[PDB]
């Protein structure tokens, strides 16, 4: 029922509760006030914090987990914690993350791996081309092609850009940490009189499924569905046209083949990541007054 004067940090596999500096004890329970069963948490009294995994130590709730503690004569403090899409947006000029709304407010982002990892607060991270825009019913965070620690590669005209993020949410009292890594491959997109292709440069990940008009088809599947991939020296991915749709851009006299969005899970050997675009074949003749 009261505020909980202490912070609170959620991230993708724990809760970690912080407790203010007093000259305190506290348990996990269930909303009810028993201890839960399976429950296993870590106490820190030097640090003043409790830490336990979603698993075993919450109740699965809907869209994210919750938590109960109990400290002391006897008060009861909740705290939810979101469940946190992977797929990184890829459009011609910039990457983005569209995220289910978390709980004005505050962001951080640290950029790379290990040692060239780097933090920003909110004015260096805006000052690179990082942006967060608070819409309603979710958020989308702006990633640069260009801020620095992201990996650029290059075959032929094809670009692939790749970077590792952990954006942290600031509120009072509250933090929210959302990790993934950002892959686009901005203008992939090639065709001919029969086929579209997509080329990226080779990268550590591989391809393993593609989806496309709610169709999710693996790899070892592609060729029985008219899409033939190279994985030799980069990916080369051919669809025919008969799976396409066909539009009539306002700055084209003629018919383009495309698709409505394209989404390309690759599998690095730790973690899988995705990425959407959206390839149309180029216009061949334009519109002239
Ligand atoms: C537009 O661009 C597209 C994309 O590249 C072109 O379509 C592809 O053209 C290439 C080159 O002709 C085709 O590859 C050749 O395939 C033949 C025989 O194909 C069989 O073996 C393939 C390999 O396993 C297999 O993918 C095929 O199945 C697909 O393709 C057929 C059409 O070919 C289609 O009907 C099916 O439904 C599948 O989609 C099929 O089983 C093969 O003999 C060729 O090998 C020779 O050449 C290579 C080098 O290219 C050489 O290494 C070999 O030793 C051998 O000498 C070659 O592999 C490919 O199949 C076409 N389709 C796709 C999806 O990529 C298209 O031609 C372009 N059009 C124009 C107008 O330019
Ligand atoms: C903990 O989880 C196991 C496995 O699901 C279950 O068998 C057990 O009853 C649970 N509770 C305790 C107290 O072990
Ligand atoms: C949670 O409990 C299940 C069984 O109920 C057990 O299999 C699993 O290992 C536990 N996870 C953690 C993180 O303790
Ligand atoms: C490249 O980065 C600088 C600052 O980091 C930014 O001003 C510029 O707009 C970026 N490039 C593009 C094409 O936006």
Request: proline share 7%.
């Amino acid at each position: 029922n009261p505020a909980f004067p202490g912070t609170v940090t959620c991230d993708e596999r724990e809760i970690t509760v912080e407790f203010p500096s007093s000259p305190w004890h506290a348990s996990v329970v269930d909303p009810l006030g028993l201890d839960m069963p399976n429950c296993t948490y870590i106490l820190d009294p030097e640090k003043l914090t409790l830490r336990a995994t979603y698993d075993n130590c919450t109740r699965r709730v809907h869209g994210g987990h919750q938590m109960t503690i109990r400290v002391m004569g006897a008060v009861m403090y909740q705290f939810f914690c979101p469940a946190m899409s992977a797929s990184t947006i890829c459009q011609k000029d910039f990457m983005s993350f569209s995220l289910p709304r978390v709980f004005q407010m505050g962001w951080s982002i640290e950029v790379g791996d290990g040692a060239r990892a780097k933090t920003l607060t909110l004015p260096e991270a805006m000052k690179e081309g990082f942006s967060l825009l608070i819409d309603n019913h979710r958020m989308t965070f702006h990633v640069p092609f260009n801020a620095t620690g992201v990996t650029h590669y290059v075959q032929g005209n094809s670009h692939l850009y790749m970077v590792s993020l952990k954006l942290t949410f600031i509120s009072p009292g509250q933090k929210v940490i959302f990790s993934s890594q950002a892959i686009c491959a901005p203008d992939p997109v090639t065709c001919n009189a029969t086929h579209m292709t997509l080329t990226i440069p080779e990268f550590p990940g591989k391809l393993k499924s593609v989806s496309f008009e709610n169709q999710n088809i693996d790899v070892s599947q592609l060729h029985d569905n008219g899409i033939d991939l190279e994985a030799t020296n980069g990916m080369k991915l051919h669809f025919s046209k008969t799976l396409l749709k066909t539009k009539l851009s306002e700055k084209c006299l003629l018919h383009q083949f495309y698709l409505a969005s394209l989404k390309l899970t690759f599998l690095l050997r730790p973690e899988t990541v995705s990425m959407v675009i959206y390839p149309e074949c180029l216009c061949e003749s334009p519109v002239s007054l």
